[PDB]
Symmetry: D2
Subunit: 146 residues, 4 copies
Amino acid sequence: GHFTEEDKATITSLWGKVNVEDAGGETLGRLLVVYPWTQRFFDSFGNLSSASAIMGNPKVKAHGKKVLTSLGDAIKHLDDLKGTFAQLSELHCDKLHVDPENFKLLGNVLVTVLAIHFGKEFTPEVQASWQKMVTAVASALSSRYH
Amino acid sequence: GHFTEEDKATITSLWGKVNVEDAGGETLGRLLVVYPWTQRFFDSFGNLSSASAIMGNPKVKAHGKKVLTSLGDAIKHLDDLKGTFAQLSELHCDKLHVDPENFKLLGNVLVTVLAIHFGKEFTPEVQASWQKMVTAVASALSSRYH
Amino acid sequence: GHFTEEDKATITSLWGKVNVEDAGGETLGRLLVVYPWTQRFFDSFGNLSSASAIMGNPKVKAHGKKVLTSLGDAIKHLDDLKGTFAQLSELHCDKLHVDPENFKLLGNVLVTVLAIHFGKEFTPEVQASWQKMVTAVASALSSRYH
Amino acid sequence: GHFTEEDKATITSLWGKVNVEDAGGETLGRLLVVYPWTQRFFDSFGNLSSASAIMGNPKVKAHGKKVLTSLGDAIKHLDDLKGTFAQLSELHCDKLHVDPENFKLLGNVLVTVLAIHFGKEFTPEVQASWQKMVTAVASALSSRYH
Ligand code: HEM
Ligand code: HEM
Ligand code: HEM
Ligand code: HEM
């Protein structure tokens, strides 16, 4: 893969406008609602039997903040996402056994959340740059499986 | 599959607020820009060499409207989508050789467009209902392949 | 979907030459080794820390037999697989939260086992018929999710 | 990703036993039969309306030889598949617009062909190493899309 100058500017600029205290909870909660099977990894977070219980769960909100903060840090290292996520790859693959397909699923739900918050600013080109980011993150986090 | 009565209500209600004349071209054009390989099915549609050419292309806008008007008719048959799409399955599978993976891709681009147009109104539960609709439509259209 | 009379004949004839007592453990064990993340669904099955432990594990062999005996019964109902697998869909979706992508994965590991056991006899046309069967079984088992 | 010493030895040793004058035609032909949509890229090869016509087509056999010869060369460069396939990535993505999902589809059909020819020698571990190879090749060839 390869980010263009335009890709980097679009990723960096849009991300600077995200609130990583609500976006993270919103993204992980939406993943858990829309694709229910993912709840299996988070049986320690409490009751996730309904949308309201998930979107209102403080451990979901707290953990989504970690997720997006680590992604925000990675956006400082676009040309080296493999190395930047090496340690989290080890955690997610070797220790938690998260299905590699889930990384792209979460990335697509972040794209949905960006489209909700930014609307018409999320043009096809802007979405293309973010789809490249989703793919790249998923590859970096599944590296230990490959 | 199975649509709950709440899935049907969501699907029909949100669709009634969709302007097909705008959403059609916006959905097909977004698919062509974001996932460029799909342009190979539309060589006769003329200039697709840049995002601005795709989003300005009269044939892309006219075709997207056909697509979304076909999906509007399908929403009147939610609990018989395979029978509803039998003719278009034959067209897309036996005659055009569309990759079944692309039906899922276009339905995901429509989810993105709905998120852009409705923002917050596109809640996690509303997205779940539409995610089941995209899957159901993909399955119905690739039925000739199965 | 749709099974041709030649798909049914292929499926039933090749299956009649399959030894389930061997193929069962061989298929589940291959899935656990090749796609290690799926081991997380089988923590109670004991030692799955190495390929030799998985392929020697008595619980994996006993479970694989259940799996393949379930698929043998399904082959007697090829043109009603969704109804046939309704109970196991509820089990795998509502109770175990299996990722629908893993049903496709296991059916692909079975294709590999059939290729190993039958060699040349597993022609391109015979594989096509079995590829439709894996897809049909995945769709039927993930039906609760749709 | 990362090949282990064991991965490299397994890939290199099994590949040294493949016949790249028949395996290539067998792999591309099987892809065209099993997953019909792929035939769309090869409308220049002649009649592909049936298994017999595909498996007997001299242009299929001739082109599959190219495919596997380029893969054989890549197996000399396991630690640098991105650079080794850079030029073919440009051809397949920028010029032919091949769907990225097809690269993994072809890789899985090569795995089926290896299982047919090598049988019990294709153990779960041996298949794991080859699945890692399939993923890595698909990533290298789709790089221009990412
Ligand atoms: C954008 C991709 C993702 C990133 C950046 C990410 C990041 C993180 C981080 C930073 C942690 C915390 C580790 C610590 O606290 O030391 C974590 C834990 C975890 N992640 Fe992820 N993650 C990602 C995707 C996923 C996906 C797709 C899954 C499964 C669907 C997943 C499941 C988990 C689990 C089960 C934990 C342990 C949490 C606990 O102990 O309660 N993650 N992740
Ligand atoms: C939401 C899924 C889809 C639906 C509901 C849909 C619906 C339609 C309909 C109704 C037509 C007929 C147009 C007319 O009568 O002139 C059509 C034509 C076509 N569709 Fe789709 N389609 C879908 C997905 C796809 C995808 C994923 C592709 C491939 C990237 C595709 C490629 C085509 C092509 C090439 C035509 C013929 C266009 C022309 O040259 O006239 N469709 N589709
Ligand atoms: C070819 C697709 C599959 C079929 C036909 C199938 C069939 C079965 C059947 C018949 C049982 C019941 C066993 C008994 O009565 O004791 C079962 C249990 C189960 N299956 Fe599947 N299954 C399939 C795919 C999967 C996949 C992809 C996974 C996840 C990696 C999975 C995870 C499980 C689990 C965790 C159990 C419960 C086992 C235990 O703890 O007792 N299955 N399956
Ligand atoms: C293991 C992965 C693959 C490799 C190593 C590979 C390699 C090659 C090579 C060496 C060529 C010849 C270029 C030349 O003659 O200068 C080629 C051409 C081509 N490939 Fe691939 N390929 C791969 C996968 C694919 C897939 C998945 C598709 C689509 C399903 C595809 C479609 C094509 C087409 C359409 C051509 C042009 C052939 C013609 O002009 O008639 N390839 N490939």
